[PDB]
């Protein structure tokens, strides 16, 4: 019902490069789930500390 296919190498890739560029992210300002850099640009100090 929610079967999702992933591999070891693919998961490592999506782990390492989900914070650099995300093809599933939104590239236009004003939408949610934007790029990680842009989200950091607006995040609070506590949020970026947790992300660290």
């Amino acid at each position: 019902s929610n079967a999702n296919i992933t591999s070891q190498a693919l998961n490592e890739f999506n782990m390492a490069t989900r914070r650099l560029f995300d093809p599933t992210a939104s590239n236009t300002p004003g939408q949610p789930n934007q790029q990680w850099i842009k989200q950091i640009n607006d995040a609070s100090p506590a949020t970026v500390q947790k992300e660290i």
Partner: peptide
């Protein structure tokens, strides 16, 4: 009786303090 300006000034200062603390809390993310 006429009001001393010190009281009004302190009231405005304290309201500004409330506002500034709320903005600082919001900025930190709370």
């Amino acid at each position: 009786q006429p009001a001393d300006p010190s009281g009004q000034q302190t009231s405005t200062n304290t309201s500004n303090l409330v506002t500034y603390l709320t903005n600082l809390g919001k900025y930190l993310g709370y």
